[PDB]
Design an enzyme around this catalytic site. Structure first.
Site, PDB file in Angstrom:
ATOM      1  N   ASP A  22       4.976  -8.767  -1.632  1.00  0.00           N
ATOM      2  CA  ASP A  22       5.232  -7.259  -1.964  1.00  0.00           C
ATOM      3  C   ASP A  22       4.011  -6.455  -2.289  1.00  0.00           C
ATOM      4  O   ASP A  22       3.564  -6.184  -3.419  1.00  0.00           O
ATOM      5  CB  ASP A  22       6.342  -7.516  -2.936  1.00  0.00           C
ATOM      6  CG  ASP A  22       7.120  -6.072  -3.142  1.00  0.00           C
ATOM      7  OD1 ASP A  22       6.570  -5.037  -2.603  1.00  0.00           O
ATOM      8  OD2 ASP A  22       8.097  -6.104  -4.027  1.00  0.00           O
ATOM      9  N   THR A  23       3.364  -5.903  -1.212  1.00  0.00           N
ATOM     10  CA  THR A  23       2.451  -4.968  -1.493  1.00  0.00           C
ATOM     11  C   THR A  23       2.702  -3.780  -2.298  1.00  0.00           C
ATOM     12  O   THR A  23       1.697  -3.001  -2.867  1.00  0.00           O
ATOM     13  CB  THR A  23       1.472  -4.568  -0.400  1.00  0.00           C
ATOM     14  OG1 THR A  23       2.494  -3.660   0.595  1.00  0.00           O
ATOM     15  CG2 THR A  23       1.128  -5.596   0.448  1.00  0.00           C
ATOM     16  N   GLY A  24       4.031  -3.324  -2.254  1.00  0.00           N
ATOM     17  CA  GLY A  24       4.301  -2.190  -3.186  1.00  0.00           C
ATOM     18  C   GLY A  24       4.825  -2.544  -4.775  1.00  0.00           C
ATOM     19  O   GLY A  24       5.292  -1.624  -5.392  1.00  0.00           O
TER      20      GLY A  24
HETATM   21  C1  ROC Z   1      12.212   1.052  -1.869  1.00  0.00           C
HETATM   22  C2  ROC Z   1      13.287   0.159  -1.486  1.00  0.00           C
HETATM   23  C3  ROC Z   1      13.587   0.461  -0.081  1.00  0.00           C
HETATM   24  C4  ROC Z   1      14.601   0.580  -1.989  1.00  0.00           C
HETATM   25  N1  ROC Z   1      13.141  -1.210  -1.730  1.00  0.00           N
HETATM   26  C5  ROC Z   1      13.010  -1.810  -2.860  1.00  0.00           C
HETATM   27  O1  ROC Z   1      12.844  -1.162  -3.946  1.00  0.00           O
HETATM   28  C6  ROC Z   1      12.648  -3.286  -3.006  1.00  0.00           C
HETATM   29  C7  ROC Z   1      13.894  -4.025  -3.773  1.00  0.00           C
HETATM   30  C8  ROC Z   1      13.687  -5.326  -3.726  1.00  0.00           C
HETATM   31  C9  ROC Z   1      14.899  -6.093  -4.520  1.00  0.00           C
HETATM   32  C10 ROC Z   1      14.901  -5.823  -5.838  1.00  0.00           C
HETATM   33  C11 ROC Z   1      13.515  -6.446  -6.223  1.00  0.00           C
HETATM   34  C12 ROC Z   1      12.407  -5.550  -5.531  1.00  0.00           C
HETATM   35  C13 ROC Z   1      12.341  -5.928  -4.058  1.00  0.00           C
HETATM   36  C14 ROC Z   1      11.344  -5.417  -3.405  1.00  0.00           C
HETATM   37  N2  ROC Z   1      11.471  -3.872  -3.452  1.00  0.00           N
HETATM   38  C15 ROC Z   1      10.370  -3.200  -3.098  1.00  0.00           C
HETATM   39  C16 ROC Z   1       9.206  -3.162  -3.992  1.00  0.00           C
HETATM   40  O2  ROC Z   1       7.844  -3.013  -3.323  1.00  0.00           O
HETATM   41  C17 ROC Z   1       9.412  -1.993  -4.974  1.00  0.00           C
HETATM   42  C18 ROC Z   1       9.081  -0.554  -4.265  1.00  0.00           C
HETATM   43  C19 ROC Z   1       8.562   0.361  -5.277  1.00  0.00           C
HETATM   44  C20 ROC Z   1       7.371   0.558  -5.627  1.00  0.00           C
HETATM   45  C21 ROC Z   1       7.455   1.658  -6.422  1.00  0.00           C
HETATM   46  C22 ROC Z   1       8.240   2.602  -7.188  1.00  0.00           C
HETATM   47  C23 ROC Z   1       9.647   1.989  -6.867  1.00  0.00           C
HETATM   48  C24 ROC Z   1       9.972   1.150  -5.920  1.00  0.00           C
HETATM   49  N3  ROC Z   1       8.337  -2.023  -6.085  1.00  0.00           N
HETATM   50  C25 ROC Z   1       8.737  -2.323  -7.209  1.00  0.00           C
HETATM   51  O3  ROC Z   1       9.966  -2.361  -7.415  1.00  0.00           O
HETATM   52  C26 ROC Z   1       7.928  -2.396  -8.349  1.00  0.00           C
HETATM   53  C27 ROC Z   1       8.310  -3.602  -9.438  1.00  0.00           C
HETATM   54  C28 ROC Z   1       7.212  -3.719 -10.115  1.00  0.00           C
HETATM   55  N4  ROC Z   1       7.130  -3.117 -11.398  1.00  0.00           N
HETATM   56  O4  ROC Z   1       6.163  -4.688  -9.900  1.00  0.00           O
HETATM   57  N5  ROC Z   1       7.556  -1.198  -8.911  1.00  0.00           N
HETATM   58  C29 ROC Z   1       6.133  -0.750  -9.004  1.00  0.00           C
HETATM   59  O5  ROC Z   1       5.071  -1.511  -8.778  1.00  0.00           O
HETATM   60  C30 ROC Z   1       6.085   0.591  -9.514  1.00  0.00           C
HETATM   61  C31 ROC Z   1       5.054   1.397  -9.563  1.00  0.00           C
HETATM   62  C32 ROC Z   1       4.965   2.625  -9.718  1.00  0.00           C
HETATM   63  C33 ROC Z   1       6.070   3.234 -10.367  1.00  0.00           C
HETATM   64  C34 ROC Z   1       6.123   4.433 -10.986  1.00  0.00           C
HETATM   65  C35 ROC Z   1       7.407   4.999 -11.371  1.00  0.00           C
HETATM   66  C36 ROC Z   1       8.382   4.562 -11.410  1.00  0.00           C
HETATM   67  C37 ROC Z   1       8.367   3.203 -11.115  1.00  0.00           C
HETATM   68  C38 ROC Z   1       7.124   2.629 -10.709  1.00  0.00           C
HETATM   69  N6  ROC Z   1       7.074   1.174 -10.058  1.00  0.00           N
END
Ligand code: ROC
Ligand code: CL
Lengths: 99, 99
Positions: A25-27
């Site tokens: 998960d690069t995000g």
């Molecule tokens: C974007 C969407 C299409 C909804 N997909 C997803 O959210 C899927 C859902 C999956 C099931 C639940 C577990 C996570 C996975 C992977 N994720 C992708 C995944 O890449 C997701 C994308 C993302 C990044 C930034 C902010 C919000 C959302 N990252 C995350 O959820 C990570 C979790 C963490 N703390 O390490 N968040 C962050 O790294 C992060 C960074 C900056 C932020 C700033 C403000 C608020 C929130 C912030 N969260």
């Protein structure tokens, strides 16, 4: 390996002696694993994403084998529906995004 | 390019003539953009992430430039904290994960 992104980049990991499937998960800033016990001390943390935040337990100096590559770092444990390998461990196996 | 992951993989995108910052996210199935106006009709979708689900507006066949590469595909608009480029458009720009 080179992984295309037509499908979710899921790999097998080993953590705490257990095999699990996890998403590369690069995000994600953090490595977030579904509920399991880990050794050593932990402290509470709130981590956020789309939808809001969840409470997790943060464990430091945890070793994970990621598709065969050992890495050590902080792992947080809590009610995630998917195990995610975030950038803190992706860097340690030399992962890059290429286009 | 080759993008390491020591920092968030943020790039510039262009959508609706506007420049925005977005995250290249192999963990995301979908591309999620902050509230903005887009042309045409939308359809509903619920997207799930770490903290739960949010309602978004789904727009198909939107033109977007990503780090200088043109993609045309589905974008969902809603209360995301971060603009996220997910796998549906990462594949269009030929992105791979390598280690
Ligand atoms: C974007 C969407 C299409 C909804 N997909 C997803 O959210 C899927 C859902 C999956 C099931 C639940 C577990 C996570 C996975 C992977 N994720 C992708 C995944 O890449 C997701 C994308 C993302 C990044 C930034 C902010 C919000 C959302 N990252 C995350 O959820 C990570 C979790 C963490 N703390 O390490 N968040 C962050 O790294 C992060 C960074 C900056 C932020 C700033 C403000 C608020 C929130 C912030 N969260
Ligand atoms: Cl770490």
């Amino acid at each position: 390996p080179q992984i295309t992104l037509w499908k979710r980049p899921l790999v097998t990991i080993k953590i705490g002696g257990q095999l699990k499937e996890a998403l590369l998960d690069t995000g994600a800033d953090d490595t977030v694993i579904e509920e399991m016990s880990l050794p050593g001390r932990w402290k509470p943390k709130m981590i956020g994403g789309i939808g809001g935040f969840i409470k997790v337990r943060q464990y430091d100096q945890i070793i994970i084998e990621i598709a065969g590559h050992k890495a050590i770092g902080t792992v947080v444990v809590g009610p995630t529906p998917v195990n995610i390998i975030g950038r803190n461990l992706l860097t340690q196996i030399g992962a890059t995004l290429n286009f």
